[PDB]
Amino acid sequence: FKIHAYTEGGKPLRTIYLPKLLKKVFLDVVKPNTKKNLETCGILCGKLRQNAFFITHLVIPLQEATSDTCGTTDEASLFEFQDKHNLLTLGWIHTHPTQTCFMSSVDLHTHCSYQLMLPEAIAIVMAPSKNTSGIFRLLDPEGLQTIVKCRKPGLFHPHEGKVYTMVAQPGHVREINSKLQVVDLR
Ligand SMILES: [Zn+2]
Ligand SMILES: [Zn+2]
């Protein structure tokens, strides 16, 4: 059987195929930062084939980090790389070096732009010290709207209501044996 995933507003979501080794590959690549209690992020890049998305490239962008944040600092090299290799942005991945697997306030704000651009966009959060991981998205439309309208100050400000959820597997995301390459732009 095939599961057809839909948003909370009833819009169809195209399947994203995620190489099943990507999470482990990401952890091993960013390991030095993880030991120093610094987050690292990566971009999930790939292509649309027939009517489904395939993540084929794990791109580690030029970035800045703390124990609680990470973010791209040179969009240019990232942009030019994706343009040159004809890659779509399908989501992003990051670590919580010591904490549990959840989406923080800043994570929700980060993810909003991804999911506005691509309704299927996903956020993978790795919590290596807990040996846990999760794949998340905002509720659409309700969670997206909450974050879009939010102008509250502070990196850790709370939000009212349910805003995010785990993605449907295997309907929205399915982990499979497939090709992958790492591109470290640092
Ligand atoms: Zn986070
Ligand atoms: Zn907010």
UniProtKB/Swiss-Prot annotation:
Zn(2+) 2 binds at residues 109, 150, 157, 159. Residues 15-145 form the MPN domain. Zn(2+) 1 binds at residues 94, 96, 107. The record marks 39 as: Indirect zinc-binding. Disulfide bonds: none annotated. A motif (JAMM motif) lies at residues 94-107. It is found in: Cytoplasm; Endosome. The JAMM motif is essential for the protease activity. Zinc metalloprotease that specifically cleaves 'Lys-63'-linked polyubiquitin chains. Does not cleave 'Lys-48'-linked polyubiquitin chains. Plays a role in the multivesicular body (MVB) sorting pathway. Required for ubiquitin-dependent sorting of proteins into the endosome and subsequent trafficking to the vacuole. May regulate MVB sorting through deubiquitination of ubiquitinated ESCRT proteins. Belongs to the peptidase M67C family. This is AMSH-like protease sst2. It comes from Schizosaccharomyces pombe (strain 972 / ATCC 24843). The chain holds residues 248 to 433 of 435 of the full protein.
